[PDB]
Amino acid sequence: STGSATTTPIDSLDDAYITPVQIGTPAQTLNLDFDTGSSDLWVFSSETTASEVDGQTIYTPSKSTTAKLLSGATWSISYGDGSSSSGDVYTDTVSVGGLTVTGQAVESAKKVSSSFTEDSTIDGLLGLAFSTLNTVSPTQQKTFFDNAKASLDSPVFTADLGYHAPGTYNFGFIDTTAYTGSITYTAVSTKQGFWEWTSTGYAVGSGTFKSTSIDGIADTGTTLLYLPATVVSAYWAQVSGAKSSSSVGGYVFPCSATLPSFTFGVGSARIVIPGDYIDFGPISTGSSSCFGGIQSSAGIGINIFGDVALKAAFVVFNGATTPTLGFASK
Structure with a gap:
């Protein structure tokens, strides 16, 4: 299999890039920041403290027929810029650019720090570093790429980011x-x-x-x-x-x-x-x-x-x- 998705700058400075991701059944499309420096796929959700949501699209697991609570699992992450988020965990179907993973850990935010709240364009992160960094406890979870790898035509993904323009993330082919x-x-x-x-x-x-x-x-x-x-x-x-x-x-x-x-x-x-x-x-x-x-x-x-x-x-x-x-x- 392969996938291919367009990634788009969030603003005129290319401060970050967002890529649409389908989560759940029926699909809920969230715009995630693909991050090769971290290993958690986390989203704004119906569980996120209401005062900490300001314009983001939320994942609502109760509306997904394929969502399952990962019982007892929690997550908590702090990034190099001082931002942070934490919550609980579901498994669900996640698709990127036509590539589908079933049983992906989707980390639902109960709390996010102010910089996430203040950025209405980013609905969460999709980590693409190695799964050894994943923060889920007590059972560490795999990244989307790690879960997809064996099914891919080639065990690769590519980043082609644009300058002041959209670009592409491809999975499984060059x-x-x-x-x-x-x-x-x-x-x-x-x-x-x-x-x-x-x-x-x-x-x-x-x-x-x-x-x-x-x-x-x-x-x-x-x-x-x-x-x-x-x-x-x-x-x-x-x-x-x-x-x-x-x-x-x-x-x-x-x-x-x-x-x-x-x-x-x-x-x-x-x-x-x-x-x-x-x-x-x-x-x-x-x-x-x-x-x-x-x-x-x-x-x-x-x-x-x-x-x-x-x-x-x-x-x-x-x-x-x-x-x-x-x-x-x-």
Whole structure:
């Protein structure tokens, strides 16, 4: 089997991407944030504290003839941005782009933190990291991809995120029309539960490539590109007036600037992030200070190849017995 679904930016900045997902019988379609950095499929629901729902579409398990309470199971998750959610668990039928999994754990939110409530466009998350990170207790549950894998034509999914435009998540096949050149595959460590890999270096604009190993994670659920402070300083030094602002929370730059590109290495191959992809717009409405899309990872503990990087590539998440990642230009 295969599936193919369009993913759409939630706003004009590409702050996140939503993909429609069918849950239950009859189908209830929710727009979920596909997150290769986490491993829970959780949704706003009829169980979510009413004051914490503000415009989201909810899953109502009592209206699904295939929903079953997973007795005794609870979940609770905290994300790198400080947001969180928790609740109980159903199993139900879940379809993405024509690919169907029966008995998928659908984690129903009883509580969500303010940033989820405040984002009316995201009805939940669909985790695509390794199932070892799934938070369901006392019986850990499998991701949608893990459950689908054996049925897929090939045990892979691909992320093709757009810049200021829709893109595609495919399951079970590699669309050879969706990228240019060849796909360069690189090793993955699953020891932390992430799609963790080592970039071979970087360049800023037209500058020379610096060969240096940068371990980080391919994370569709993180907006920006988080890299070591040395790398980030080298990038922003090429932008007149750019500075790191403690009060804003990262590098800012004059909105009048033209940003240089940023290149990252995948083996001997190179992925070029155009400068425009690094512009996240005014820090507050009407400001002439703009927020940068490349930020320091120093306070995180891990480097994160988030959407800013991934949207410049066609990315293969290869879930073969030994997982690997593939990157192609497009």
